[PDB]
Design a protein around this ligand. Structure first.
Ligand SMILES: C[C@H]1CN(C(=O)c2cccc3[nH]c(=O)oc23)C[C@@H]1C(=O)O
Length: 167
């Protein structure tokens, strides 16, 4: 039993809710919240900008130190950093950004990072300003993640479409 509430069950291990991931993190304090990161951990907009804003920019400060030490992430890769006031940990995962011309096949590699964590609160990777089709992202999620994932979808219209079209 866990504290996630109001989710629709899509499969044995994947759940979905129309929710603001920031507000959901603030209420649940999950062990892991996933950020929709880029390779530079520059949290300017989309999910990343919202999560970082909710930490009063502490996520960005920590991220800048991480990059100064380690260099950029790989597209499809991840790193574990603090969850600040939102979660125990933040798993920063880089899905391909279609608006940068990155290979969409890397979306499966990106979701594989979730399997290193038993339970996660997450957004759909590569959705939103990353330019991928969220229906496809949901399909890859379901077909790749084996651990327990609670997906927060900000847009109610998109949420309804994702549910109604789910196979
Ligand atoms: C397509 C993504 C983009 N996105 C946000 O940008 C966002 C998330 C939480 C709070 C916020 N306040 C704000 O102004 O923007 C946000 C959440 C969407 C999703 O994952 O469904």
């Amino acid at each position: 039993v866990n504290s996630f509430s109001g989710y629709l069950k899509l499969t044995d291990n994947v759940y979905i809710k129309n929710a603001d991931i920031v507000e959901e993190a603030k209420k649940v304090k999950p062990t892991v919240v996933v950020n929709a990161a880029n390779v530079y951990l520059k949290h300017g907009g989309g999910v990343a900008g919202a999560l970082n804003k909710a930490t009063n920019n502490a996520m960005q400060v920590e991220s800048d130190d991480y990059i100064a030490t380690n260099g950029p992430l790989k597209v499809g890769g991840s790193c574990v950093l603090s969850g600040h006031n939102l979660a125990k940990h933040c798993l920063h995962v880089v899905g391909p950004n279609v608006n940068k011309g990155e290979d969409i096949q890397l979306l499966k590699s990106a979701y594989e990072n979730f399997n290193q964590h038993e339970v996660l609160l997450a957004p759909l990777l590569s959705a939103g300003i990353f330019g991928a089709d969220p229906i496809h992202s949901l399909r890859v999620c379901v077909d790749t993640v084996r651990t327990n994932v609670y997906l927060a979808v900000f847009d109610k219209n998109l949420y309804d479409k994702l549910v109604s079209s789910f196979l």
